[PDB]
Amino acid sequence: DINFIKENLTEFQHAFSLAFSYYFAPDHRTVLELYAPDMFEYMNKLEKGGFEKISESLKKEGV
């Protein structure tokens, strides 16, 4: 809920950054595919076009 999401957002931040480093260090990406097969799918959707959409939604506000 709001209380957990507002007190410890650094832990979700740590989870996303750790999943990012496991996805893009090329020696061990398949670690993420094996031990967390939906975090791998989340990052794979985010890499195949989600990053472009977040960049567009920021650059529209940038002008």
Partner 1 sequence: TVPDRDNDGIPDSLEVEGYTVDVKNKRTFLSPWISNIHEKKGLTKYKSSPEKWSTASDPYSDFEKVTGRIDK
Taking CA atoms, 13 is separated from 17, 21, 39, in Å, by 6, 12, 14
From candidates 1, 27, 38, 61, binder to partner 1 by CB under 8 A: 27
Please state the closest distance from residue 35 (CB atom) to partner 1, in A: 7
Is residue 15 part of the contact set for partner 1 (CB under 8 A)?
no
Binding window for partner 1 (CB under 8 A); candidates: 9-17, 27-35, 40-48, 54-62: 27-35
In 3-state terms the chain splits into helix, strand, coil percentages (rounded to 5) of 85, 0, 15
Is residue 38 part of the contact set for partner 1 (CB under 8 A)?
no
